[PDB]
């Protein structure tokens, strides 16, 4: 059922894919504002001990909602909070209470506003909260990784999490493509190994198919310390993730 699960994920990531370049149609918020929102969402997820999949789902919900709706400057953080609440309800065993999110928003939006925006997000997404994320594909990729290296998985997760910061240029790539690029980049960084043939057969993504995404992720990884938003790097500066964020990105990717 694993291959069928991966096939279903590949089929579903297209339907759940947010509109490419939705920030152009947004009259008030920009890519930098979304990056700040994702930074704050990473900080909240570490504050409440939420899973990485929860943050990935929340980012997907924000992207789809802003693709299908227009949000002003003030309500962007409310949209992010509602998406985080929905992702925690869907994925986490015990979602944080709405009062907890209201508190973490520095008492900006009340409980009623948070619940109303949650209702709006649920209506816009038509209760399609099962969007495949980078984590879901990365786990399946790890299942086809030999040998099981913890640093490889930690660095792949770190790169996938970094890819959530900038919509440009990461919303033009499928979540499977981003996960494959992250896995290959991590494998080359820590182990010096290329894209495995097992994943070549399983996914159909050859090394040259991920080359644009791979180069984009390498550019982001090289400039990760200089990035304005640093929540993910601090989060992956912990023994839980083997401190992969402190690793030096490879200077040249031999492609």
């Amino acid at each position: 059922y694993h291959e069928d699960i991966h096939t279903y994920l590949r089929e579903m990531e297209v339907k759940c894919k947010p509109k490419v370049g939705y920030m152009k149609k947004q009259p008030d918020i920009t890519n930098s504002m979304r990056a700040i929102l994702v930074d704050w969402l990473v900080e909240v997820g570490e504050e409440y001990k939420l899973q990485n999949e929860t943050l990935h789902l929340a980012v997907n919900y924000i992207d789809r909602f802003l693709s299908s709706m227009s949000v002003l400057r003030g309500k962007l953080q409310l949209v992010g909070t509602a998406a985080m609440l929905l992702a925690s309800k869907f994925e986490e065993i015990y979602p944080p209470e709405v009062a907890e999110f209201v508190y973490i928003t520095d008492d900006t939006y009340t409980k009623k506003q948070v619940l109303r925006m949650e209702h709006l997000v649920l209506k816009v997404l038509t209760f399609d909260l099962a969007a495949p994320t980078v984590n879901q594909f990365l786990t399946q990729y790890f299942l086809h990784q030999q040998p099981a290296n913890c640093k490889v998985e930690s660095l792949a997760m770190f790169l996938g999490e970094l890819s959530l910061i900038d919509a440009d240029p990461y919303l033009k790539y499928l979540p499977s493509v981003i996960a494959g690029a992250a896995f290959h980049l991590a494998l080359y960084t820590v182990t010096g190994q290329s894209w495995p043939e097992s994943l070549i057969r399983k996914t159909g993504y050859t090394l040259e198919s991920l080359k644009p995404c791979l180069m984009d992720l390498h550019q982001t990884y090289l400039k990760a310390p200089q990035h304005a938003q640093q929540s993910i790097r601090e989060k992956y500066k912990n023994s839980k993730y083997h401190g992969v964020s402190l690793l030096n990105p490879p200077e040249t990717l031999n492609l």
């Binding site: 700040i36 900080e43 909240v44 953080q77 928003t105």
Partner: peptide, 11 residues
């Protein structure tokens, strides 16, 4: 530092 009012930083 998760407790932030992002409206001020957005502008």
């Amino acid at each position: 530092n998760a407790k932030r009012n992002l409206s001020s930083e957005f502008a």
